[PDB]
Tab-separated table of C-alpha atoms and ligand atoms in Angstrom:
chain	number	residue	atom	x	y	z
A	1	UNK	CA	-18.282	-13.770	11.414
A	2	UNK	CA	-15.187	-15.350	13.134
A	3	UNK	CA	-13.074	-15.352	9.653
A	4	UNK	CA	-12.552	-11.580	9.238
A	5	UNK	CA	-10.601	-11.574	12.436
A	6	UNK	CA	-8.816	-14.763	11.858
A	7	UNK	CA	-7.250	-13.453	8.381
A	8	UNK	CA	-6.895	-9.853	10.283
A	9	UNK	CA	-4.816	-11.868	13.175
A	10	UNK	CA	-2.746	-14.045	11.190
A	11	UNK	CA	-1.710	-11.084	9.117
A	12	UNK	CA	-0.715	-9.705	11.857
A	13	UNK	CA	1.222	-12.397	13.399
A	14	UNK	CA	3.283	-13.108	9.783
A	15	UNK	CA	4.121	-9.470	9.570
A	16	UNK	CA	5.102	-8.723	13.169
A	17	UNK	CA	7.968	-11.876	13.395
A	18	UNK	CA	8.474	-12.312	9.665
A	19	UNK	CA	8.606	-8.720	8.194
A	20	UNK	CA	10.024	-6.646	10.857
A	21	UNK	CA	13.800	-7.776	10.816
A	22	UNK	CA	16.612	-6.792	8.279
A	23	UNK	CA	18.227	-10.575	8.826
A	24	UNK	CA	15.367	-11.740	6.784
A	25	UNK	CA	15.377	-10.217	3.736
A	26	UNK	CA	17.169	-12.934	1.449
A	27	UNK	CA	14.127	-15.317	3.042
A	28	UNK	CA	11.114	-12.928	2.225
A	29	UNK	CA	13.112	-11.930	-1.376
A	30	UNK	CA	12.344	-15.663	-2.387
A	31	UNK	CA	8.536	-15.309	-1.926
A	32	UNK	CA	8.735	-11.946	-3.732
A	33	UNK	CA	5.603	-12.266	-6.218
A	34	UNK	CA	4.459	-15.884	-4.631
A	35	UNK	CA	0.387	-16.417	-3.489
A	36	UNK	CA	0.302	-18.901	-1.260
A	37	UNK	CA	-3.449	-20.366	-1.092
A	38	UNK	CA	-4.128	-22.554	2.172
A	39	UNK	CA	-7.141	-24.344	1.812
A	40	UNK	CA	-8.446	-25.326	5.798
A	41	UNK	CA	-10.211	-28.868	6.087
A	42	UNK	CA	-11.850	-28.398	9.043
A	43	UNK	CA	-13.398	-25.112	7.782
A	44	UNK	CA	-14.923	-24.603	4.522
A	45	UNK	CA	-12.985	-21.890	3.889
A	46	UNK	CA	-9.383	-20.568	2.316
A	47	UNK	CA	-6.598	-18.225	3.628
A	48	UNK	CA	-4.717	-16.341	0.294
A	49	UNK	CA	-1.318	-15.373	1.491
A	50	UNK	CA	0.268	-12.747	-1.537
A	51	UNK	CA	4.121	-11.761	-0.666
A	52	UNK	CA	5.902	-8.353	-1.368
A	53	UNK	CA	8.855	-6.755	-0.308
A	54	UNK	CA	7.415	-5.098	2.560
A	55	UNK	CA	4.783	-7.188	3.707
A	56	UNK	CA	2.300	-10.255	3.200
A	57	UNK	CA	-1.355	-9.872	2.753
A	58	UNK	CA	-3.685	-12.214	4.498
A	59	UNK	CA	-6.987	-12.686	2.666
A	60	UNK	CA	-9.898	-14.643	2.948
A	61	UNK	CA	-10.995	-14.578	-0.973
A	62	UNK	CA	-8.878	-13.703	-3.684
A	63	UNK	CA	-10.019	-14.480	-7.578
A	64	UNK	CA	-6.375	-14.822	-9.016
A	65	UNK	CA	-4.352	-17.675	-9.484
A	66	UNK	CA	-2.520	-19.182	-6.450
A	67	UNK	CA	1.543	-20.326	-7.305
A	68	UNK	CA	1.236	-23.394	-4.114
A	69	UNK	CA	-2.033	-24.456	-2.823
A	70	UNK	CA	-1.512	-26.343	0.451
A	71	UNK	CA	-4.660	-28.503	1.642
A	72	UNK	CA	-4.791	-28.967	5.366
A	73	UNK	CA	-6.834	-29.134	8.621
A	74	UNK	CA	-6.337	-25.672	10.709
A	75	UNK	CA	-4.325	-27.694	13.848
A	76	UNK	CA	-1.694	-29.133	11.144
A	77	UNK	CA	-0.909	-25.397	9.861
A	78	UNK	CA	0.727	-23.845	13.323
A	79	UNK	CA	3.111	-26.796	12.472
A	80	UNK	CA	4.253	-25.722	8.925
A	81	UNK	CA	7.589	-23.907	11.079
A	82	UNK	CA	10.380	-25.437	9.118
A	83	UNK	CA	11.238	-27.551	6.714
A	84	UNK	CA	11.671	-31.268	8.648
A	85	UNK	CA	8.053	-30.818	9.647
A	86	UNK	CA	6.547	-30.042	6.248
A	87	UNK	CA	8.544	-32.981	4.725
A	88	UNK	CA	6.780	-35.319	7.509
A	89	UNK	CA	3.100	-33.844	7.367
A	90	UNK	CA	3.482	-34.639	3.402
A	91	UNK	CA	4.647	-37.876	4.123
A	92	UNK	CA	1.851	-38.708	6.483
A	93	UNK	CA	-0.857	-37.089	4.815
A	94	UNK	CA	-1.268	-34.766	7.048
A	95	UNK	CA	-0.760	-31.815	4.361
A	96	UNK	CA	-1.438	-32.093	0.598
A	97	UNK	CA	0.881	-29.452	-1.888
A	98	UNK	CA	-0.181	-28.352	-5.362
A	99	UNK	CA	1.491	-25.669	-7.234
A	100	UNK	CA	5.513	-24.801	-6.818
A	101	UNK	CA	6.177	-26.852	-3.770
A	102	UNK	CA	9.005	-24.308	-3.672
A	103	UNK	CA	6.683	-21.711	-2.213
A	104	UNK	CA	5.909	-23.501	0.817
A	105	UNK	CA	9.449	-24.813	0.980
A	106	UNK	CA	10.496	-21.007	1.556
A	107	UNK	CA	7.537	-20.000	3.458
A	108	UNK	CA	8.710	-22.811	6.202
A	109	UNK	CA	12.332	-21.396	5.658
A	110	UNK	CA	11.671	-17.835	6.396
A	111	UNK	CA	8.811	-19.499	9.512
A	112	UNK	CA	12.275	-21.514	10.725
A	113	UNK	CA	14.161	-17.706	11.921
A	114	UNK	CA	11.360	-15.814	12.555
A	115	UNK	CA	12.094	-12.997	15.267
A	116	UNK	CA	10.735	-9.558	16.810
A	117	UNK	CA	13.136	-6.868	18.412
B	1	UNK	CA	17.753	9.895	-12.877
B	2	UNK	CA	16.315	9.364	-15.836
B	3	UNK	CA	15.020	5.895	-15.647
B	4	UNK	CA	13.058	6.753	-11.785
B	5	UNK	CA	11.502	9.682	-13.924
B	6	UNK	CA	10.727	6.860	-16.905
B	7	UNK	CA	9.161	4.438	-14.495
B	8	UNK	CA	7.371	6.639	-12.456
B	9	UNK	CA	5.610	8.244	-15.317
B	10	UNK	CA	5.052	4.657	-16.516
B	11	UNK	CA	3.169	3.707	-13.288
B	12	UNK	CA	1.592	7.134	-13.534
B	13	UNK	CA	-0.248	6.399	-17.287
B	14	UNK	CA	-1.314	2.892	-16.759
B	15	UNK	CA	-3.076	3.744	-13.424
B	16	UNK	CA	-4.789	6.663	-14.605
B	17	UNK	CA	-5.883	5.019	-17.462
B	18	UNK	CA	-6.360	1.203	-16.732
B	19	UNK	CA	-7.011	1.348	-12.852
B	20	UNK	CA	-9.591	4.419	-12.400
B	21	UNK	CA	-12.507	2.761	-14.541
B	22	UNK	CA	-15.012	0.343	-12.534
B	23	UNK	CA	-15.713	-1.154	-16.628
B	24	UNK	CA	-11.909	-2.602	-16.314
B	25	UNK	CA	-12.441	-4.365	-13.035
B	26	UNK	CA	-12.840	-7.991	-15.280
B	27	UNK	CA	-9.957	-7.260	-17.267
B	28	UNK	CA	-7.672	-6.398	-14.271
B	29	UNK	CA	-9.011	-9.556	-12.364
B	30	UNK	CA	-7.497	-11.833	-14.989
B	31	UNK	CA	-4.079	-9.683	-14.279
B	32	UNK	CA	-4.316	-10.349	-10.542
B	33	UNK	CA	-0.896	-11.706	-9.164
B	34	UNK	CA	0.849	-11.461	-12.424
B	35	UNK	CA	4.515	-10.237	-13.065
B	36	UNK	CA	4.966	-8.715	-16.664
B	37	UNK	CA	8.681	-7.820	-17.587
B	38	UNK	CA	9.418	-5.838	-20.624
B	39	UNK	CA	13.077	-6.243	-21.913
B	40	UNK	CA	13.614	-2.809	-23.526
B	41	UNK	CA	15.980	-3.253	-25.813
B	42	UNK	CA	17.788	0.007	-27.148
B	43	UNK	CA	18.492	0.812	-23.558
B	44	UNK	CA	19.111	-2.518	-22.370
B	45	UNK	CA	17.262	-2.082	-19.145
B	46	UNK	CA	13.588	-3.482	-17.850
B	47	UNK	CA	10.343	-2.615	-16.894
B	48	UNK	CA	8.831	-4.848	-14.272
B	49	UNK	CA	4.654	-4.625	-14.427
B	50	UNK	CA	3.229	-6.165	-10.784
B	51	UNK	CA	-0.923	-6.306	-10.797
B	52	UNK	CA	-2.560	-5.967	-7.694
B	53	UNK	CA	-6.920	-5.302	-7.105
B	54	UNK	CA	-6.299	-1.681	-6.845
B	55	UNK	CA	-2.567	-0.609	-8.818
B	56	UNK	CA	0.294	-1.777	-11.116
B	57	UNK	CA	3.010	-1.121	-9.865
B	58	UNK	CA	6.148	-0.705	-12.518
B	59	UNK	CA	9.252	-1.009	-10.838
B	60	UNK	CA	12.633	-0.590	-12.751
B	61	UNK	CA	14.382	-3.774	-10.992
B	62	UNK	CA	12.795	-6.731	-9.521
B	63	UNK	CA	14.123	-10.245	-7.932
B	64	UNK	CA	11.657	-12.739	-8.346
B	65	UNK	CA	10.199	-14.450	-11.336
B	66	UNK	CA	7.953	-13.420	-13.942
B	67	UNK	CA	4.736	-15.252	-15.930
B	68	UNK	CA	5.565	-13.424	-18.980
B	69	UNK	CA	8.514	-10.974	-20.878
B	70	UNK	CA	8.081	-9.439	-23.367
B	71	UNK	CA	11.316	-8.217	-25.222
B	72	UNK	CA	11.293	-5.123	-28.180
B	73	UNK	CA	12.947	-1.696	-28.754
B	74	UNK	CA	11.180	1.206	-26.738
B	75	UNK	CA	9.589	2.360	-30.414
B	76	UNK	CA	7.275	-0.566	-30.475
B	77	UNK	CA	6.110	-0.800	-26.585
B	78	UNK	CA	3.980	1.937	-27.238
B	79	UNK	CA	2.101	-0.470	-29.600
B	80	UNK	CA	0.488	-2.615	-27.046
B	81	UNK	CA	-2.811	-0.533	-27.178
B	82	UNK	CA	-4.983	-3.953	-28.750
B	83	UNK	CA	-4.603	-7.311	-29.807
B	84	UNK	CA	-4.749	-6.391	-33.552
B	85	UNK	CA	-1.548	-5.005	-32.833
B	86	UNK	CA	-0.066	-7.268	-30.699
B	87	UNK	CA	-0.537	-10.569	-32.970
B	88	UNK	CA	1.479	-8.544	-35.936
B	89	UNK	CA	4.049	-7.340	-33.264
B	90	UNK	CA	4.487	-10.623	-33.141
B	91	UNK	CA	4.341	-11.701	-36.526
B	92	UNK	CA	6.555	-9.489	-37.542
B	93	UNK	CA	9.677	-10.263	-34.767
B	94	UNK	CA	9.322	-6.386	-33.218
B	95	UNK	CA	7.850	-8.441	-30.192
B	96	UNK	CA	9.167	-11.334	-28.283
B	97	UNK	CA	7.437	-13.011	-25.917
B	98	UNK	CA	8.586	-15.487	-23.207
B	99	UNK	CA	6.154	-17.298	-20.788
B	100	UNK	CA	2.624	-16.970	-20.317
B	101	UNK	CA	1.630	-15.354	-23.748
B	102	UNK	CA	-2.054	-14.967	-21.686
B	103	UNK	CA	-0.358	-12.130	-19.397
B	104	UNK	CA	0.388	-9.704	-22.380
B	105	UNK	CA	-2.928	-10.722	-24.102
B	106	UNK	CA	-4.583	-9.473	-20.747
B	107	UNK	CA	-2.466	-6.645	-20.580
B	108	UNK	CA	-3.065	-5.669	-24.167
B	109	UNK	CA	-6.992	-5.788	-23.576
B	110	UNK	CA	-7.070	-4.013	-20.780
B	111	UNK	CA	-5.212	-1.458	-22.771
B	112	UNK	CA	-7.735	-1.617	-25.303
B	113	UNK	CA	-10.630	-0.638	-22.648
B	114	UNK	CA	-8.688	2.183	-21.308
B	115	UNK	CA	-9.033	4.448	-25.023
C	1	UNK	CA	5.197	-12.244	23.888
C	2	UNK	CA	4.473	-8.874	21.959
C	3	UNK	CA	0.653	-8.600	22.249
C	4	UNK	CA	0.740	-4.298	21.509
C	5	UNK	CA	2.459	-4.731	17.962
C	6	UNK	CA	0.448	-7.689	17.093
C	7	UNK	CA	-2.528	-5.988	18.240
C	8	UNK	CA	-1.992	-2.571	16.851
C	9	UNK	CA	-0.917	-4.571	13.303
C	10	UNK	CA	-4.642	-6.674	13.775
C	11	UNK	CA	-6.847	-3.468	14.090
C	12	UNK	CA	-4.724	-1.864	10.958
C	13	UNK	CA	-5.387	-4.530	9.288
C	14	UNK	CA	-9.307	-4.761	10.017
C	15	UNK	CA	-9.712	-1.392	9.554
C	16	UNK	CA	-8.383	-1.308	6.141
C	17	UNK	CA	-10.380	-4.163	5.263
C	18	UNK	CA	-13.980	-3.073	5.962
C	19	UNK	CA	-13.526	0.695	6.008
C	20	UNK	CA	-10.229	1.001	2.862
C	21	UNK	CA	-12.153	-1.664	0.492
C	22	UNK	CA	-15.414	-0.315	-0.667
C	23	UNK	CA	-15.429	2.118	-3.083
C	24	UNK	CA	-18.976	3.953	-1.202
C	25	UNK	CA	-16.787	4.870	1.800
C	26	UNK	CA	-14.825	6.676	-0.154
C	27	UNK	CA	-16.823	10.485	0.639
C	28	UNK	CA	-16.502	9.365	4.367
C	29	UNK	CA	-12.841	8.416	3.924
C	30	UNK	CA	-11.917	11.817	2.716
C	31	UNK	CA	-13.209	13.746	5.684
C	32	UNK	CA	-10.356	11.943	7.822
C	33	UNK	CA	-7.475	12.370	5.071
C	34	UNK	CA	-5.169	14.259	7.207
C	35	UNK	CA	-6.563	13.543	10.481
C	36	UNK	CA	-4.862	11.603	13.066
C	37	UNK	CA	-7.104	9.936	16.048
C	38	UNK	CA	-5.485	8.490	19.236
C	39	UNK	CA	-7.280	6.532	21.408
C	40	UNK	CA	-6.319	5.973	24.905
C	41	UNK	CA	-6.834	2.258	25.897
C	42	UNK	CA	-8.286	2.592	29.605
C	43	UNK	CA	-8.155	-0.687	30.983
C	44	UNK	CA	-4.810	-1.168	29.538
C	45	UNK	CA	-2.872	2.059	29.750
C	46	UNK	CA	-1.930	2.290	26.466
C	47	UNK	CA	-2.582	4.125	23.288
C	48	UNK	CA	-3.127	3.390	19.399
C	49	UNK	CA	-2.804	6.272	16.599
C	50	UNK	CA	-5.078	5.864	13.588
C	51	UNK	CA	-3.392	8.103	11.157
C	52	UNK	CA	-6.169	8.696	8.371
C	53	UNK	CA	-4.612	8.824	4.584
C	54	UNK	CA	-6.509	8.581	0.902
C	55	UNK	CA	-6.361	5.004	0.276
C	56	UNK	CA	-5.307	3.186	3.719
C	57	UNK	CA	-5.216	4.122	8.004
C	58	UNK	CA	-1.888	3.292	10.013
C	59	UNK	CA	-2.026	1.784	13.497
C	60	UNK	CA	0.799	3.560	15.886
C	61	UNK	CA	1.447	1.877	19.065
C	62	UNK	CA	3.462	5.448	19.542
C	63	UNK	CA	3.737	8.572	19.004
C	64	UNK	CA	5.412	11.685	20.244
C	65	UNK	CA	3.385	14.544	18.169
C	66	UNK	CA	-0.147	16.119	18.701
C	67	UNK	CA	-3.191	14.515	18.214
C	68	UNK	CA	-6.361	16.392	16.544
C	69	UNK	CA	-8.618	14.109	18.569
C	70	UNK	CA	-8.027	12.002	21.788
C	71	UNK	CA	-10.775	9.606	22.600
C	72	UNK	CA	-10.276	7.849	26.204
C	73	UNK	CA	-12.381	4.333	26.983
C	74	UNK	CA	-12.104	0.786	28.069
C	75	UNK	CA	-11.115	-1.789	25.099
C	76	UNK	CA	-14.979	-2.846	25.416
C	77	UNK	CA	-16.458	0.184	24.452
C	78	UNK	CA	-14.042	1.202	21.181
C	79	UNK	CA	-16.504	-1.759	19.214
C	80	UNK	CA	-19.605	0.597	20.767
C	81	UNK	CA	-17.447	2.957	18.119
C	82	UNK	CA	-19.360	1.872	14.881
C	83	UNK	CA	-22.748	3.587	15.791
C	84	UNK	CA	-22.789	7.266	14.581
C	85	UNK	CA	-26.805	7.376	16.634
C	86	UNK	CA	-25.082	6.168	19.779
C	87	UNK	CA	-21.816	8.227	19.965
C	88	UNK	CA	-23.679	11.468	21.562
C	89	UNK	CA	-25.078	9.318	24.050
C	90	UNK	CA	-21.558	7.667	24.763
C	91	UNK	CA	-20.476	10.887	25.353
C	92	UNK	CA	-22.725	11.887	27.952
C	93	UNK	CA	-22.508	8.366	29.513
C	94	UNK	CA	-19.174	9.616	30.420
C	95	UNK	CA	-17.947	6.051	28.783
C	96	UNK	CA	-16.232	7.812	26.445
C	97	UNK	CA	-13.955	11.252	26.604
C	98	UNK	CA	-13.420	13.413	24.247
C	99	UNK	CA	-10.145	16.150	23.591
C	100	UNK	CA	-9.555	17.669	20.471
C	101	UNK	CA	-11.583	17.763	17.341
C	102	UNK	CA	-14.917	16.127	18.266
C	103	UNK	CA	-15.400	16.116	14.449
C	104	UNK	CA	-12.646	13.530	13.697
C	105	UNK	CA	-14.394	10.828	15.645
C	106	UNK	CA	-17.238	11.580	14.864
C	107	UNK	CA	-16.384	11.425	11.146
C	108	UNK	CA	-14.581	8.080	12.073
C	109	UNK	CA	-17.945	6.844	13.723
C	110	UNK	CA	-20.050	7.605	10.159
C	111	UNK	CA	-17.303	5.655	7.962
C	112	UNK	CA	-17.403	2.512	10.583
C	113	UNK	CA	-21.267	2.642	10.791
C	114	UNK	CA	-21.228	3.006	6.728
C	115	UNK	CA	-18.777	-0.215	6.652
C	116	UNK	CA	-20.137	-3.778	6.765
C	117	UNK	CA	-18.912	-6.540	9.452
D	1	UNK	CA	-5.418	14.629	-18.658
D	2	UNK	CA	-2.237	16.442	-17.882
D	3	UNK	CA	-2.656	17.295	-14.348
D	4	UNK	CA	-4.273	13.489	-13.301
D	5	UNK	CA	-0.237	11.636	-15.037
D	6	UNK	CA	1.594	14.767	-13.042
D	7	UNK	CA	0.190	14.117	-9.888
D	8	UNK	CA	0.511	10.474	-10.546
D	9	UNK	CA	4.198	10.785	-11.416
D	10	UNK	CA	5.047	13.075	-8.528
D	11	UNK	CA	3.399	10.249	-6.216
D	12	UNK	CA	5.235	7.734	-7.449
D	13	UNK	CA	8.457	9.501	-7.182
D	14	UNK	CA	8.082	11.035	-3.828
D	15	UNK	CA	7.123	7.103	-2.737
D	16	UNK	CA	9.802	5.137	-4.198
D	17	UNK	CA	12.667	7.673	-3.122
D	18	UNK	CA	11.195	8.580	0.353
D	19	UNK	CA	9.092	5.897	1.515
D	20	UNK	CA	10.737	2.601	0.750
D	21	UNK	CA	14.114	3.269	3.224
D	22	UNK	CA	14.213	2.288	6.834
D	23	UNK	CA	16.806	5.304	7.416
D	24	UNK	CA	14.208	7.786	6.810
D	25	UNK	CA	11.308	6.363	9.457
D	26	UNK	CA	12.184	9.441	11.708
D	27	UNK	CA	12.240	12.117	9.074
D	28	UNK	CA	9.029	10.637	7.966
D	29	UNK	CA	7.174	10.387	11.081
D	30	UNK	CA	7.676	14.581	11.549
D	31	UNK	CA	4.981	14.829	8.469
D	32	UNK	CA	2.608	12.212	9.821
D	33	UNK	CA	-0.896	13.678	9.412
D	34	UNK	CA	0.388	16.679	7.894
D	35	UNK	CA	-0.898	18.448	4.148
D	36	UNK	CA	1.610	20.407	2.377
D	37	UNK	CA	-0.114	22.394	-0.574
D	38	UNK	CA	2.340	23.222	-3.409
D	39	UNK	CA	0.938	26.020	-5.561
D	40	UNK	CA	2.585	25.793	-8.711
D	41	UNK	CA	2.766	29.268	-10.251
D	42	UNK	CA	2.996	29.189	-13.994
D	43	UNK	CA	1.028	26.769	-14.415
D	44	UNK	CA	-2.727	27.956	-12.664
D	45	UNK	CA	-3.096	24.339	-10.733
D	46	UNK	CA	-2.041	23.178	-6.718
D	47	UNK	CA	-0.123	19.750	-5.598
D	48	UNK	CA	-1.516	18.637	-1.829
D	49	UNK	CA	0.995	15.997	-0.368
D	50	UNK	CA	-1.091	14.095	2.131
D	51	UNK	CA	2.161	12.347	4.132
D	52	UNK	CA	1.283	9.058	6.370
D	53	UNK	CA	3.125	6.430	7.981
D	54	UNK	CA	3.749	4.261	5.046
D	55	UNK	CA	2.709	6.430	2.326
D	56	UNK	CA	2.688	10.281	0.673
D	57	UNK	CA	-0.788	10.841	-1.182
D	58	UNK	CA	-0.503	13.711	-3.967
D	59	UNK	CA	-4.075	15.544	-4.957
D	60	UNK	CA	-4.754	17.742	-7.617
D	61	UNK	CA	-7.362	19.324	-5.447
D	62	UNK	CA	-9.005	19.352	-1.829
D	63	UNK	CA	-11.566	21.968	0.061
D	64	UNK	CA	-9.417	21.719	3.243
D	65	UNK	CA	-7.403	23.878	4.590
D	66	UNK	CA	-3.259	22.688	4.454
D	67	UNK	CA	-0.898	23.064	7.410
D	68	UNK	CA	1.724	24.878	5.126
D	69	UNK	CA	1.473	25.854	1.929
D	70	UNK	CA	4.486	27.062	-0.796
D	71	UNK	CA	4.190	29.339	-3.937
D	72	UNK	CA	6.675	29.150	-6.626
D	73	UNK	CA	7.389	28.143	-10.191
D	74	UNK	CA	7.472	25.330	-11.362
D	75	UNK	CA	11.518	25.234	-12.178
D	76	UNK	CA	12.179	26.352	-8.824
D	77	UNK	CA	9.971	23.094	-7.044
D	78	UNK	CA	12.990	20.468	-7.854
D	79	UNK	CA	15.305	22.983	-5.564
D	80	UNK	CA	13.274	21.831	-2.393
D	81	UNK	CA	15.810	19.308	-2.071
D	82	UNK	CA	17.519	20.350	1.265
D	83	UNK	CA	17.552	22.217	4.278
D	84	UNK	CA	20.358	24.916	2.914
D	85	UNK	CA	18.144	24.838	-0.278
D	86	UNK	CA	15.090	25.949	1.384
D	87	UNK	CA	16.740	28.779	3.165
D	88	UNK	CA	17.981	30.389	0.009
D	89	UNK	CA	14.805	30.224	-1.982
D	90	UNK	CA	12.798	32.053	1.024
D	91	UNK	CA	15.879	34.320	1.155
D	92	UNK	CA	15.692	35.264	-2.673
D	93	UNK	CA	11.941	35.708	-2.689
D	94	UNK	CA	11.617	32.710	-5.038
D	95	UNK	CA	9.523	30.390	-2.633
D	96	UNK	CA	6.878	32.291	-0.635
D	97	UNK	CA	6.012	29.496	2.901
D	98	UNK	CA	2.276	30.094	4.395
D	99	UNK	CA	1.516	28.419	7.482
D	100	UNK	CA	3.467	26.192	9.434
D	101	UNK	CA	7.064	26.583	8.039
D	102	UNK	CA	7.959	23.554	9.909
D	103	UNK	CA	6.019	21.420	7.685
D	104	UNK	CA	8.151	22.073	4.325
D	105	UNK	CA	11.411	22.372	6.604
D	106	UNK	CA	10.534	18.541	7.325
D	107	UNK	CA	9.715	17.668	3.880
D	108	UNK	CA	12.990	19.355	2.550
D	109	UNK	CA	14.744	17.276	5.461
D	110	UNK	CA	13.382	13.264	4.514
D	111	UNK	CA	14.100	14.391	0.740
D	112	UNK	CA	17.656	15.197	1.738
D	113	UNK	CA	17.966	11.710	3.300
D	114	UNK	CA	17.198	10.512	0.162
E	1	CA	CA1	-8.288	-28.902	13.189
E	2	CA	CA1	2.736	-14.590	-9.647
E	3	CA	CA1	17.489	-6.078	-20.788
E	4	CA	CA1	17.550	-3.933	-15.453
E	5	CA	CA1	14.722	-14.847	-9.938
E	6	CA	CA1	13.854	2.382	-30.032
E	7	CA	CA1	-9.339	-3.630	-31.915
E	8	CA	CA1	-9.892	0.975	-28.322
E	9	CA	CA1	-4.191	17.741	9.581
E	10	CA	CA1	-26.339	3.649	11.773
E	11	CA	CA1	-24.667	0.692	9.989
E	12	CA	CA1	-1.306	29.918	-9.851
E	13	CA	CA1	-5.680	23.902	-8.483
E	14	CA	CA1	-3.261	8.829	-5.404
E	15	CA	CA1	23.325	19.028	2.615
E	16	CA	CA1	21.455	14.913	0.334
């Protein structure tokens, strides 16, 4: 399988330009506790995204219950990078949000200034 | 440094007895993701409970937002071994609970399966 | 961009997933607690340090102390790295050199082939 | 059922005082891959730290062989504390160091920093 490496990469990718700075603690300190489940269209399959203080876990199945589920195809989620962009793939139906839309709301916030140094 | 010492030995009990058992693995699994704050109230500090697959991890001060509290003197917390005990905890006022009353009700009957 | 940390936090991340999860790797596991394994990436110059602990393995892009096992190969023959039967004839091959501890990697080679994928 | 909540408590402690700061990535990076074996002497039982990049693992017991290991009593243990610490409790005969001294020098170190 292709999905072991996909989760494997992406936590990767989240950790490396999200986690690594000190500038974004107050971002990350909003998701503290927060699952964000992202359900991809194209795919059959789900990406569980679990926030701590230190880092975010990536994982392809996870049997607890998910604060904002966000339902779109795998092309529309490289786009979720702020919060202008998730108000317009709502909007066009592009991306559908269950749960806390707050979680999402943050995770785009925190996307918005991510960095590596 | 008494509190790090209270919380650590905390963290210590409830992983030795509720996360080394593979019997508890469907009682943890309804845990998964869950916050669980106890208000202690003599001491007027909390007790933050975070469930994970594999650990709990009890911290002594947390920022973000918990599915249940539960709020009683240090006396009583001691109680939550079973539900038995829990439902006249509550019946009685020596236990307050705020949010998801399913959270201590899992917590409780994990407890239970432990001893 | 920064392919080494995203690639060094990718492998951590795999590794912990198939060989950190289950608990029947757990006797194979505990022959590496202690043990740290750097690999020297041939093709690309560059190392990675697997430091080997009781529940999880961190991925070092760097690292200034001694290794009990170096293992030097190309990035296409570290996946070759799963098969405990084939890592004696790796060996001779020449594909794949060997400094240290010979018993770390092959104690890494028996969890891997032990793990499923 | 003593030993299992020690250990346990001692991991937890050594984790959430050493391992959570950014300041002490240096001091902690001195112990990676090392086993420090704590023989506790009034009580007939052995603590092995296990330190990593991200963690400290603490075992009641192992059949390896640890890159340092320190006798002493229990009420002398919570002294380990510093550099100038260490020192003194070699000095007095208190805290007897086998194998690679270095290894509880950089312990004693990262829990200074903390
Ligand atoms: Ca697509
Ligand atoms: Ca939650
Ligand atoms: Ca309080
Ligand atoms: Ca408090
Ligand atoms: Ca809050
Ligand atoms: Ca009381
Ligand atoms: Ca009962
Ligand atoms: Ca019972
Ligand atoms: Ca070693
Ligand atoms: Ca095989
Ligand atoms: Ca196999
Ligand atoms: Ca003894
Ligand atoms: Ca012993
Ligand atoms: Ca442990
Ligand atoms: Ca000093
Ligand atoms: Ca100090």
């Amino acid at each position: 399988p292709f999905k072991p490496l996909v989760t494997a990469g992406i936590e990767s990718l989240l950790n490396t330009f999200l986690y690594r700075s000190p500038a974004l603690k107050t971002a990350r300190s909003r998701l503290l506790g927060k699952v964000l489940r992202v359900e991809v269209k194209g795919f059959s399959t789900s990406l569980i995204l679990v926030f701590s203080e230190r880092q975010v876990d990536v994982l392809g199945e996870w049997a607890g219950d998910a604060d904002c589920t966000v339902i779109a195809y795998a092309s529309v989620l490289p786009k979720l990078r702020d919060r202008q962009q998730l108000t317009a793939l709502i909007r066009s139906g592009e991306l559908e949000v269950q749960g806390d839309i707050q979680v999402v709301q943050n995770f785009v916030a925190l996307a918005d200034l991510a960095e590596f140094d």
